[PDB]
């Protein structure tokens, strides 16, 4: 099984800055390599495939490069939207395998365009639903014990 | 009678492939084989002029075109190969303008598969086969 290995495991960077994640495979994967981005509590999204080809609807500040065993994703000018975990996947050999991910967060006059404010409601409702199902699973045994 | 050739595609990118050429007499050249690591869709497939691999696929030079030109086409212009969702193209082509001997020989020249439908993703010099 191919072990794809990312670094750093997390990192912080300021807006406008230039960022470079790396992904290193335990074998030559001949550029059969895809980069995925995943913001918190959202589904993964395809950034790059075959090592260097941008997907549809991907900002051009994202770029990918490398070959052989060593590859890198580079965000040229980091916007605030780009805080996420990034994953590399290789599909050269089966099974497909994935990096452990690089978490990317910001470091220490915005536009009115309220998007950050609206993002909070789904996040909170999601966290509450976790708690509900958590306590539903705690009831489950007790209710089984009551029936015997 | 029967001339055979073969070509191993290689590039910086994910593209790989072996191309086979067979030609009986001065009948057509049957091109065949498989290319992997392509994006789904159509990819330009041309015999370029030189079998010069010193500078990757750039050193292959332009399309093989001795007649300085479909009827109006380069000799090397074999159109498109088609890759599926598996990233693979099965090559199956018959052509009369190219040849494995004489003035229109491709022996000692380069096959190139391209990024888009007709950059150079992979190439290889065309050698004499068993």
């Amino acid at each position, epitope marked *: 099984d191919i072990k794809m290995t990312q670094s750093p495991s997390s990192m912080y960077a300021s807006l406008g800055e230039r960022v470079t994640i790396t992904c290193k495979a335990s074998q030559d994967i001949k550029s059969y390599l*895809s980069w995925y981005q995943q913001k918190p509590w959202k*589904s*993964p999204k395809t950034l790059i495939y*075959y090592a260097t080809r941008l997907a549809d609807g991907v900002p051009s500040r994202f770029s990918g490069s490398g070959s052989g065993q060593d590859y890198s994703l580079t965000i040229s000018s980091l916007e605030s939207d780009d805080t996420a975990t990034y994953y590399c996947l290789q*599909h050269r050999e*089966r099974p497909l395998t994935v990096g452990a991910g690089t978490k990317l967060e910001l470091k220490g006059s915005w536009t009115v365009e309220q998007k950050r404010l609206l993002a909070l409601d789904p996040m909170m409702e999601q966290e509450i639903e976790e708690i509900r*199902q958590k306590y539903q699973c705690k009831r489950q045994p007790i209710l089984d014990a009551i029936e015997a | 009678m029967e001339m055979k050739a073969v070509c191993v595609l290689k590039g910086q990118g994910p593209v790989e492939g072996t191309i086979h050429f067979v030609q009986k007499g001065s009948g057509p050249v049957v091109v065949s084989g498989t290319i992997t*690591g392509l*994006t*789904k869709g159509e990819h330009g497939f041309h015999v370029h002029q030189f079998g010069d691999n010193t500078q990757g696929c750039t050193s292959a030079g332009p399309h093989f075109n001795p007649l300085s030109k479909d009827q109006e086409r380069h000799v090397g212009d074999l159109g498109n190969v088609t890759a599926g969702k598996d990233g693979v193209a099965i090559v199956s082509i018959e052509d009369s303008l190219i040849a494995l001997s004489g003035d229109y020989s491709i022996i000692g020249r380069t096959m190139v598969v391209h990024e888009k439908r007709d950059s150079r993703l992979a190439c290889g010099v065309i050698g004499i086969a068993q």
Partner: nanobody, 116 residues
Framework: EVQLQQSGAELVRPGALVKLSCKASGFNIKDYYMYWVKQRPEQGLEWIGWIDPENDNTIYDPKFQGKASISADTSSNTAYLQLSSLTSEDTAVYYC??????????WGQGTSVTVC
């Protein structure tokens, strides 16, 4: 406009079977592969397997040999993942996606499964 609708959140007893679904609209799943991806809480993505709906050929990660069974109904344009013998190990978010062998063009919103 493409969309992958996945089934809703499940919550089941140990040993339970569950069958997740992925309804594609905007593309014929026959022209793609339908993938499944697991993501345990506070962990990364694991690829489970894919199916080629055109011939029902399925590749799996051997890790999921036993647990996971992928299927597609080309008529209803829907892909399925079935997890059996569920344990706490299986509590995760399962994403379905569709794409060529070299990329996922489309991702589902994901179905959370919780096992008590």
């Amino acid at each position: 406009e493409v969309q992958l609708q996945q089934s809703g959140a499940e919550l089941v007893r140990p040993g339970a079977l569950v069958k997740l679904s992925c309804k594609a609209s905007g593309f014929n799943i026959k022209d793609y592969y339908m993938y499944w991806v697991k993501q345990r809480p506070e962990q990364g993505l694991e690829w489970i397997g894919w199916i080629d709906p055109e011939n029902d050929n399925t590749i799996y990660d051997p890790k999921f040999q036993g647990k996971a069974s992928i299927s597609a109904d080309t008529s209803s344009n829907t892909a399925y993942l079935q997890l059996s013998s569920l344990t706490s190990e299986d509590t995760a978010v399962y994403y379905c996606g569709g794409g060529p062998l070299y990329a996922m063009d489309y991702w589902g919103q994901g179905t959370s499964v919780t096992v008590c």
